[PDB]
């Protein structure tokens, strides 16, 4: 667990409620959304301008929800040998 | 193009009649022939030609003798070398 | 924007000369030459036409 | 038409299209010139590269502006003719307009004036034109020599040279010449534009052109055999001194 | 001769069958090893003898012997790079008093990298965060590499060049491990300095269209802004970005939170050009009594390396010229040849400002 | 920028042309005498085989 | 075209060795020198100015200056009597150092064909023709004649 939570910024209360439903409602509620008929979501996509939010809510992601946190970084995943990406 | 660096410049002009004459007899030296043909009557018919091509109608020569299966190549070898070689730089 | 586009054909050169003069000079020895000679009773004019 | 403009100041301060205008001079033929007391000089070269050209009827490297006055240029022979063309004109409509004959100052601001106006002007690009207006006001013996650079900046001087190998006679006119004390007879401005050239026409003849400017609207250009004679003089007096 | 002291404990340190240890890493760690060799095999050991249980970490070099494996000694990981041993350098000849001029754009290097590392108490009063990296670009040719240098005297700690060249290899891919190796030594080396030579030819923002190959160039900063701001906020020392093109930068690189001191360098005026010629006056051959502010005054603004250049072609005089020392009228002359003569290409002077 | 030339070449081959003429120029040269110092030049520096 | 580097090459292969000659450490011991036909369509910053303190610039030689060219190719060269070397100094216009030596060399070869121990004055009048035309191709570039 890392040591940021949600409290140490505002304003992005609006973008916060957008994570609530996607990442944390379907860990407790997943019995609730079966018996509606809808499936979780998979993911979102945040960018924005360089610099606001993005890592920051991260780690309130997995801090708060207190579950297993596995980083997997875009540019690591090139490498010179064939089949090494993909693996 | 500046001296200093290449000291002689030779330019080859193309080949023609007279000079496709000898070389016509060269490539086919290596091959059988037939002293009924005519050296400079050949290398007339093609016109613009080069060295490679000289050597294809010589080359071409033994490949029509091969469907009569005879050992010598006549006459009429030659005129069918010739329009086979003429059709493929006249092609692209 | 305009500025882009424009290749800038009239600027002088670091070496102080022009840049699309000196390529126009090229096509004169790309084209047909001219020759010509003045003599005493009168003046001869001559050219050649290219392909 | 075209409005961009061309000259754009760098972020030292100067221009680069000014700048890059002066070097048209340095690679052109070398114009020098000299004055005494009731007379005045301009010398010019022409370009050995290229043989058979008729001196008759090619134009003179010093284009003649008035009766009084006179206009040398060096540097590009192409733009020189613009400057001299709306000079001439100016010459005429100044003589029509007040009444009265154009001096050697009022030609030199003017033909540094239209300089200043392609600089300052959108879409057209500076002379790389340095021409040498030399001449005598009416009613004045005095010779005025006024220098007009590319750039638009005039000044009067004695002995000045353009075009190149220009550092080379300048150091040879702060020697030999001396502007508190200049020469008093013609014979001695001819013999001293002569040896200006020495260092960089290279032994020549047919490619010296020296036009003498006298008072009372007098202009004589010295012929080939005429030139030919001061030579000999100064090289008998150069290797054996 | 020394060998021969060494000989003696060749009937142990030699002959023994410990040494010959088979060097590989531990991919798993149950508290049971899965370790997996460089011949592509793996296997599952204890610990040894003198192996203590919480020496072994996950993600280790652990060499084991070459017969029956077993764990003995641990070992520093990752061993194959050996490209940044040679960063490193030892003790620069630029020292911090050769930066010539009192201009305050020194004072600003001090406080950000200097006083954090000599005085790490100062700030931890006020409970603030001292600037993470820096930002040094300029106009090529006012010194910005003897600053680079002259910061690295100061510090007596490991310092680190990274040329802009460097971080892109022969093969794709590897790029990405090249900023991984820099950022390694951090937490193995603490309280050192790390900068970054001409970053143009890293720095991203290229955008894609039309040269179809552009994209191999911005995957090392994204490896590269990964490595220093990624999720985990993993920092301790100072980052330094150089290059002489802000303009093909990558705007996301300028924006602060990875550069906080931005410090570009300008031309020195009458009073700034003074002190270079000062600096100057102490070497070579000076004569009594001649005043260098005249000197500096008639040279117009240019680049500080331009202004070192008078002073050594000023001594060039007196061998052409028959001088004894160099005096005030060679030094006149050096205006029209340093400036003057060589106004023709061959310098900057504020040349490129963008591109 | 213009001048006069007593013989001048402009075109393909300018210092090849220009080197024959020059050689041969003369000042009492006639306009019978002109037309074969031009023709003759532009056989040597042409780039065919015959002249038509 | 046979060498490709998406214009990325461009950089690191011409920084390297601007960063060589300035953020390398160095006490004044390595000597570089660059020299080709035309330096201004290069980078002035690749140039590194206050490193090089010299630029020397390389013109046309006049007629003093190619009789001692002239004398350097012909010293180990045998030459006739006739042959003089003011006079072919006075008809090479507009030449450079190495088309000097191309008059000489052409000069050795023409005397070579005919295989004569003393190349005679016929042979450097054919040479220094054939070099300024065929050999030496003289374009008009800024002339404004």
Redesign the interface.
């Known amino acids: 667990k890392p040591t940021e939570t949600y409290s140490d910024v505002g304003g992005l209360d609006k973008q916060i409620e957008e994570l609530v439903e996607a990442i944390v409602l379907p860990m407790k509620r997943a019995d609730k959304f079966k018996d509606m008929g809808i499936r979780a979501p998979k993911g979102a996509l945040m960018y924005g301008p360089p610099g606001t939010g993005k890592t920051l809510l991260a780690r309130a992601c997995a801090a708060q929800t207190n579950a297993t946190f596995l980083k997997l970084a875009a540019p690591q995943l090139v490498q010179m040998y064939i089949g090494e990406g993909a693996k | 193009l500046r001296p200093g660096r290449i000291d002689r410049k030779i330019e080859f002009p193309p080949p023609s009649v007279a000079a496709r004459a000898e070389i016509l007899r060269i490539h086919s030296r290596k091959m059988n022939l037939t002293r009924g043909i005519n050296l400079r009557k050949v290398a007339e018919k093609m016109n613009g030609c080069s060295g490679a091509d000289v050597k294809g109608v010589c080359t071409e020569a033994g490949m029509y003798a091969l469907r009569e299966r005879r050992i010598h190549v006549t006459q009429e070898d030659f005129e069918l070398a010739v329009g086979k070689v003429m059709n493929k730089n006249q092609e692209t | 924007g305009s500025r882009r586009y424009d290749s800038r054909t009239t600027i002088f050169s670091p070496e102080g000369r022009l840049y699309q003069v000196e390529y126009a000079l090229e096509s004169i020895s790309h084209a047909g030459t001219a020759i010509g000679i003045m003599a005493s009773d009168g003046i001869v004019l001559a050219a050649e036409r290219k392909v | 038409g075209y409005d961009r403009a061309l000259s754009i100041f760098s972020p030292d301060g100067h221009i680069f299209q000014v700048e890059y205008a002066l070097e048209a001079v340095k690679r052109g033929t070398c114009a020098v010139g000299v004055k005494g007391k009731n007379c005045v000089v301009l010398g010019c070269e022409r370009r050995s590269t290229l043989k058979l050209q008729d001196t008759r009827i090619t134009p003179s490297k010093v284009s003649k502006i008035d009766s009084h006055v006179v206009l040398s240029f060096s540097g590009l022979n192409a733009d020189s003719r613009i400057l001299i063309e709306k000079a001439r004109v100016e010459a005429q409509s100044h003589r029509l307009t007040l009444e009265d004959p154009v001096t050697v100052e009022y030609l030199t601001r003017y033909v540094a004036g239209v300089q200043q106006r392609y600089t300052q002007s959108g879409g057209v690009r500076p002379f790389g034109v340095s021409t040498l207006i030399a001449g005598f006001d009416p009613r004045d013996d005095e010779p005025k020599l006024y220098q007009t650079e590319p750039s638009g900046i005039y000044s009067s001087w004695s002995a000045q040279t353009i075009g190149r190998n220009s550092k080379t006679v300048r150091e040879f006119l702060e020697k030999n010449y001396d502007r508190k004390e200049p020469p008093a007879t013609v014979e001695e401005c001819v013999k001293l534009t002569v040896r200006s050239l020495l260092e960089v026409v290279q032994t020549g003849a047919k490619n010296i052109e020296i036009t003498v400017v006298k008072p009372d609207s007098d202009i004589v250009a010295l012929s080939s055999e005429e030139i030919n004679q001061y030579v000999t003089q100064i090289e008998q007096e150069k290797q054996e001194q | 001769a020394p060998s021969h002291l060494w000989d003696i404990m060749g009937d142990r340190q030699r002959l023994g069958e410990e040494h010959p240890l088979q060097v590989a890493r531990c991919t798993k760690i149950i508290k049971k090893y899965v370790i997996n060799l460089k011949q592509i095999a793996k296997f599952v050991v204890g610990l040894g003898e003198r192996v203590s249980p919480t020496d072994i970490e996950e993600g280790m070099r652990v060499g084991v012997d070459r017969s029956k494996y077993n764990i003995e000694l641990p070992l520093p990981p990752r061993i194959d790079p050996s490209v940044t041993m040679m960063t490193v350098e030892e003790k620069p000849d630029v020292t911090y008093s050769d930066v010539g001029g009192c201009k305050d754009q020194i004072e600003k290097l001090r406080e950000v990298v200097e006083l954090p590392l000599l005085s790490p108490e100062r700030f931890a009063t006020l409970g603030i965060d001292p600037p993470k990296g820096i930002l040094l670009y300029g106009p090529p040719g006012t010194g910005k590499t003897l600053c680079a240098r002259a910061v690295a005297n100061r510090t007596d700690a490991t310092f680190i060049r990274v040329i802009g060249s460097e971080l892109v290899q022969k093969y794709v891919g590897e790029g990405a491990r090249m900023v991984r190796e820099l950022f390694e030594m951090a937490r193995t080396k603490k309280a050192c300095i790390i900068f970054f030579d001409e970053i143009d030819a890293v720095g991203g923002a290229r955008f894609d269209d039309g040269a179809g190959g552009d994209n191999e160039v911005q995957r090392t900063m994204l490896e590269l802004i990964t490595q220093l701001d990624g999720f985990d906020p993993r920092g301790n020392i100072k980052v330094m970005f150089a290059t002489n093109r802000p303009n093909t930068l990558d705007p996301a690189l300028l924006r602060p939170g990875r550069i906080d001191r931005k410090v570009e360098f300008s031309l020195p005026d009458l009073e700034g050009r003074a002190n270079i010629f000062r600096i100057h006056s102490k070497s070579m051959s000076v004569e009594r009594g001649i005043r260098w502010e005249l000197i500096s005054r008639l040279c117009p603004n240019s680049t500080g390396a331009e202004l070192r250049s008078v002073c050594t072609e000023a001594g060039m005089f007196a061998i052409r010229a028959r001088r004894k020392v160099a005096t005030e009228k060679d030094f006149l002359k050096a205006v029209d040849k340093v400036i003057s003569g060589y106004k023709k290409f061959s310098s900057t002077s504020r040349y490129m400002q963008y591109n | 920028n213009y001048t006069g030339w007593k013989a001048i070449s402009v075109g393909a081959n300018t210092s090849a042309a220009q080197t024959l003429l020059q050689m041969d120029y003369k000042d009492d040269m006639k306009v019978d005498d002109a037309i074969e110092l031009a023709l003759k030049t532009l056989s040597k520096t042409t780039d065919s085989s015959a002249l038509t | 075209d046979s060498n ?1 580097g ?3 090459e461009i ?3 011409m ?2 060795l ?2 060589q000659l ?2 390398f ?1 160095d ?1 004044g011991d390595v000597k570089v020198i660059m020299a080709t036909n035309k ?2 369509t290069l980078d ?2 690749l ?7 010299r ?1 020397i610039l390389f013109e046309n030689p ?3 200056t190619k009789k001692k060219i002239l004398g350097i190719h012909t010293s180990k060269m045998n030459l006739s009597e006739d042959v003089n070397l003011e006079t072919l100094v006075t008809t090479k ?2 030449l450079s150092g ?2 000097i ?2 008059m000489c ?2 000069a050795g ?1 023409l005397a070579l064909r005919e295989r004569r121990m003393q190349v005679t004055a016929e042979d450097f009048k054919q040479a220094k ?1 054939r ?15």
């Open positions: 490709s998406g214009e990325r950089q690191r292969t920084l390297e601007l960063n300035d953020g450490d006490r330096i201004e002035p910053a140039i590194r100015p206050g490193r090089i303190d630029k006049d007629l003093s216009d507009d190495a088309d030596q191309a060399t052409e070869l023709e070099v300024m035309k065929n050999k030496v191709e003289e374009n008009l570039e800024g002339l404004y004649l």
